[PDB]
Amino acid sequence: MVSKGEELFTGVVPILVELDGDVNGHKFSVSGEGEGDATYGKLTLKFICTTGKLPVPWPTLVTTLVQCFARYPDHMKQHDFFKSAMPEGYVQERTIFFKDDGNYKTRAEVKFEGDTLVNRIELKGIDFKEDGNILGHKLEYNAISDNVYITADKQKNGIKANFKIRHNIEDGSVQLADHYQQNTPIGDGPVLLPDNHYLSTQSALSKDPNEKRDHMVLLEFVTAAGIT
C-alpha cells in the first residue's frame, strides 16, 4: 500500500509562496513561484520582493519561504507527517533566534489550492540591532545546508523540529540562527506521527541575470534520513 496524501506528490507539483513580513517595523512582502518533485526531493523556486528592497538578507528567509517535498525513502514512508496532512494541509510555526540579535516568529499555512501547493506566511521580527548582521546586510549571499531534526508532538497531533543554520558573515565569521518549529494539521483526518528522524536539506542561492527586482533563485534538495 501507498497512502492518500503521498499520492499528490508522485509528479511535479507547482508551488506558490506568499509572505508578509515586519522586522523591527520594516514591512515587506515576498512572492515566489516554482515546482517541487518529491520523488527526487527537488525544489526549484524564484522569489521576488514585491514591495521594493528586502530589508533583511535573503538567506535569512530561505527556511521560512514546503517540507512536504522531502524525499522519504521507501522504508521511511510511514514517518512522513507532511504529506499525510495533505490536501487539507498543516500550520507551520517557528521561532528563529539569531544569536546576539533579534528573532523571527513565523506562522504559515501549507495546503493545496487545486493542483498547486501553496505556502502562505506571516513573519514578525523584533529586537534586531539596526547595525547588526541582519538589518545591516552583512551576510553573504550563500547557500545553507543542515539537518532538520524531527520528533512527534502527540499533544498537537503533529511534529516539532529543531535545527541550526550557520549563515556566513562577510568578515568570515558566522551568524547562528537557532530554529524551533512546530507543525499541526489543519484537517481532522489521520496523520503520520513519526519516529525521530531528520531532513538533510541543501539550498543553493543564485540570481537571475535578467531580473532587476530584488529576488532570489533557489535550487533545493530535501531528503529524509536517520532510520536505517
Side-chain angles (χ1 to χ4, degrees), residues 1-3 5-6 8-153 155-211 213-228:
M1 218 164 75
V2 160
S3 117
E6 156 180 354
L8 278 53
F9 294 90
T10 53
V12 176
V13 174
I15 300 168
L16 301 169
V17 183
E18 297 289 324
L19 178 149
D20 292 320
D22 173 335
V23 175
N24 280 39
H26 300 276
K27 296 182 184 182
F28 60 98
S29 299
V30 171
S31 62
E33 300 184 14
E35 301 183 319
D37 193 358
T39 300
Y40 305 98
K42 181 177 183 177
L43 287 159
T44 53
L45 294 167
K46 178 176 170 188
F47 299 96
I48 306 164
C49 180
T50 62
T51 47
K53 177 176 192 196
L54 198 70
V56 298
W58 280 106
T60 73
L61 298 184
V62 169
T63 60
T64 296
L65 293 166
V66 290
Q67 291 170 319
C68 51
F69 289 102
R71 185 183 66 86
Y72 276 72
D74 183 76
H75 75 280
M76 294 182 61
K77 282 182 176 305
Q78 299 310 128
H79 299 104
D80 185 353
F81 165 82
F82 306 99
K83 297 182 189 54
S84 81
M86 297 294 165
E88 293 84 2
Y90 53 79
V91 178
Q92 178 160 301
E93 289 170 295
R94 298 209 180 96
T95 303
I96 307 170
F97 294 102
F98 293 89
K99 185 179 173 60
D100 300 308
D101 210 337
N103 64 87
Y104 298 162
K105 292 185 176 82
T106 66
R107 186 183 188 285
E109 293 189 9
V110 185
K111 71 185 68 147
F112 279 87
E113 295 290 356
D115 302 314
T116 302
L117 188 286
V118 178
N119 182 19
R120 289 179 186 85
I121 310 144
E122 300 197 323
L123 177 155
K124 186 68 167 289
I126 65 174
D127 287 331
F128 286 87
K129 296 171 182 169
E130 261 303 334
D131 202 43
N133 294 320
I134 287 81
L135 291 175
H137 296 276
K138 310 186 189 181
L139 299 182
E140 294 175 351
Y141 191 78
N142 277 173
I144 61 165
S145 171
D146 224 293
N147 293 332
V148 175
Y149 293 100
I150 295 171
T151 194
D153 185 0
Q155 105 103 197
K156 303 297 220 75
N157 198 33
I159 60 167
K160 292 179 196 305
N162 76 87
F163 56 101
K164 292 175 180 282
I165 302 298
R166 294 181 211 276
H167 296 289
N168 287 341
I169 304 167
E170 65 192 6
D171 68 356
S173 188
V174 43
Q175 173 64 65
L176 178 62
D178 282 294
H179 288 62
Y180 301 86
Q181 177 178 333
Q182 291 175 18
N183 297 62
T184 74
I186 292 174
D188 308 303
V191 295
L192 296 174
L193 301 188
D195 291 317
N196 292 0
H197 67 287
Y198 57 92
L199 306 179
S200 174
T201 308
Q202 295 85 45
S203 305
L205 281 63
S206 61
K207 298 292 189 183
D208 171 353
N210 296 315
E211 179 59 68
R213 293 170 294 179
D214 198 0
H215 73 284
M216 172 173 69
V217 178
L218 291 185
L219 172 64
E220 179 169 297
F221 292 95
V222 189
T223 309
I227 301 177
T228 69

